[PDB]
């Protein structure tokens, strides 16, 4: 939760969630502004699930 995927390779480096989730979204071929324009909707769906 705190540092993403960088704590398995070497040392731990911190990062905020909206940026970490933007990276994850970019990982599957969707441009990263889509997350920034839909943050509240995405959070609501996550909590409901």
């Amino acid at each position: 939760i705190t540092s993403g995927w960088t704590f398995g390779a070497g040392p731990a480096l911190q990062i905020p969630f909206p940026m970490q989730m933007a990276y994850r979204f970019n990982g599957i071929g969707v441009t990263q502004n889509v997350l920034y324009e839909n943050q509240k909707l995405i959070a609501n769906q996550f909590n409901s699930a």
Partner: peptide, 22 residues
């Protein structure tokens, strides 16, 4: 630039105006 959260102000350079100044 009104919908994003935590967006800051700055200046963005342009690589054509210095050339077109002359």
């Amino acid at each position: 630039c009104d919908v994003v959260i935590g967006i800051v102000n700055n200046t963005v350079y342009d690589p054509l105006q210095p050339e077109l100044d002359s």
